[PDB]
Structure formats: C-alpha cells, structure tokens
C-alpha cells in the first residue's frame, strides 16, 4: 500500500529518458518501481490515459496489481517478461510506426493484453498441465493457460480501484474486452502455428492489407506472438542471459516430468542435455521466429531491427552449436 503511495506521486520520466522507444532495450538494471513508471509512460504516450479518462490513482493501483500477480519464484515467466513484452509492443507502435495504422480501442487492448498475457503463469507449458490432469485442464478446453491468463486479467480489471476502463462507453468496453481476449489467446504458440500459414501467404502474394477487418485481427494475433518472444531479438549479451532463464524454467519442468509424471522430458526440458541448447535454439528460431519477423517487416519496414537482432542471435547460437 505504501508502494502505491510512493508510485502515485513520483514523476514519470520521458520516453526518451527511459529508452523504452528502443528495440534494443533492457530491464536488467531497472528497479521494480522504475518498470511500473515506464508502463505509465507507455499508457501516457499512447494517449490512452487522456482519451479514456484514466485517473492516475487507478492506473497505478491496477499496474501494481498485475505486478504482484506474476509469480516471483517462476524463472522466466514472471513480471519482467510481461513488461519486456509490453515495451516491445510499445516500441513496435512508436518506432516501428503502427499506431498510425490502428484505432485507439485496438492500441489500448494490445497494451493491456501484452501486460497480462501470462498472469499467474506457474512455470509450465500447456502440454504439461494437460498430461498431468491439472484441474485447470478439466476447466478449460484448448489454450488452457492462455484462457487462465485472461480469466485473471479480467478479474483484476473488475477489482475496485482498478477499473482503468471505467471511462469507456459500454459498447467500447464490450469490444475492447473482446479484442483483449483474442490477443491473450493468440499468445498460445499452437494458435500461432495453426494460423500463421494463412498470414504468411497474404504477405507472400503482396495481397495482405490492413483495411480488411479479418486480415487485421489475424495480424493482431501475429503481433502478439511477435512481442511475446521478442526476447530472441535482443543484443547477444541480453539474449544470452534471458535464454538462461527460459533454460532453467524448462529444466525445472523436465524434473517434474520424470519425478511426478515418470515420463521422459523432451530434450529441450531435459536438464541433462544442457549442451544441446544452442542447436535447439537454432532450430526453434528457424521454425518459429525468422519466418515471423520477416513477415512483420514487410508490413512495417521500421520493424526490421527485430528481424536484424533475431538472425544476429541465430548466427551466434549456430556458432556455439558447433562448439
């Protein structure tokens, strides 16, 4: 509660000051309070704060709430991931110049979504929770975790003194929430795969066009994924270290798989195989990433730094894979 006092009374530095306009941005050295501050600057500089009558008081409480609802004990999927995603998302709209391509309702939704896309993530993938018959699997059908992340997001927005949306007409609110649901679900890698093909072609065939309502909301999914794993597009020293966390969290799951599940983990989560990391990274980048960031640049050239940083790390992993 004092955390709210101190926060809702500190000066929010400029975006320039905070270097949040950068695709090459890092949080490693920021404090907790600083990250929250960036967030506020994000909302502010996207005009979300003024166009939706947000009270400094409320936004602050809300942000704080999301912060405290990411698990500390969880290796990669903690608050700094939600934060690094939203900053990527923010960088995309500004420097990548996409803001000029979509509505204020969409921007708001993307930001709120980016921030909460992994709420209460318990450091384990959809595959595991399904195969271990977690009650969450009994509750939700497909995109289990992502459904939960949203159930949470929404719980918080309905919390008292957290209604950062309170200012919206009922129609606005109603469709914002729709988009937010779509956004969070889109961060399910399975949907990214089962949908990206479609989108890769409209690009390929120089046919892709935002105006099209459907073509847009597809792209909005693709944009979510884009930011969700933007970490892979970071300077080597950063990519290095954040890959260290993904590493541990995976291995942590791998342990559970053979200790409670009594199965063998995939090599990627097989702690013992730590020496096959870099090729596993390479294959993943090839399979999941380059493909996507290429696309994103065709849509917006100013988004190229992402593609550049991506293949640049792929370069360094490949080298390593060859010892």
């Amino acid at each position: 509660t004092r955390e709210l006092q101190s926060l809702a009374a500190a000066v929010v530095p400029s975006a320039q000051t905070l270097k949040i306009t950068d695709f090459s941005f890092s949080d490693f050295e920021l404090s907790d309070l600083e990250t929250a501050l960036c967030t506020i600057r994000m909302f502010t500089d996207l005009n979300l704060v003024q166009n939706f009558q947000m009270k400094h008081e409320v936004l602050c409480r809300w942000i704080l709430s999301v912060k405290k609802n990411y698990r500390k004990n969880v290796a990669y999927h903690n608050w700094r991931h939600a934060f690094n995603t939203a900053q990527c998302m923010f960088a995309a709209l500004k420097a990548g110049k996409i803001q000029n391509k979509l509505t204020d309702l969409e921007i708001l939704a993307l930001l709120i979504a980016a921030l909460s896309h992994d709420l209460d993530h318990r450091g384990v993938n959809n595959s595991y929770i399904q195969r271990s018959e977690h009650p969450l699997a009994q509750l939700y059908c497909h995109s289990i975790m992502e459904h939960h992340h949203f159930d949470q997001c929404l719980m918080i927005l309905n919390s008292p003194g957290n209604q950062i949306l309170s200012g919206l007409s009922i129609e606005e609110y109603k469709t914002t929430l729709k988009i937010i649901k779509q956004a969070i679900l889109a961060t399910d890698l399975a949907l990214y795969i089962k949908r990206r093909g479609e989108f890769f072609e409209l690009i390929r065939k120089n046919q892709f066009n935002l105006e099209d309502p459907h073509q847009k909301e597809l792209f909005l999914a693709m944009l979510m994924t884009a930011c969700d794993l933007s970490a892979i597009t970071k300077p080597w020293p950063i990519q290095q270290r954040i890959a260290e966390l993904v590493a541990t969290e995976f291995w942590e799951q791998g342990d559970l798989e053979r200790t409670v599940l009594q199965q063998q983990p995939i090599p990627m989560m097989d702690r013992n195989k730590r020496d096959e990391l870099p090729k596993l990274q390479v294959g993943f980048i090839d399979f999941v990433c380059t493909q996507l960031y290429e696309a994103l640049t065709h849509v917006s050239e100013d988004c190229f730094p992402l593609l550049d940083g991506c293949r640049k790390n792929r370069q360094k992993w490949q080298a390593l894979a060859e010892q």
Binding site: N125, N126, S127, H142, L189, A190, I193, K194, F250, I266, P267, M268, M269, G283, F284, F287, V288
Partner: peptide, 17 residues
C-alpha cells in the same frame, strides 16, 4: 490440439501442443 500428422514431431520436440 489437432494438427497434420506430418507436423506432429517438430511441434512436440518444441514445447508446443
């Protein structure tokens, strides 16, 4: 989570599905 059977190996060897 039903995908083409050819995809299935790659999908699984990464944390997906």
């Amino acid at each position: 989570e039903a995908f083409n059977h050819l995809e299935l190996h790659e999908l699984a060897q990464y944390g997906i599905i």
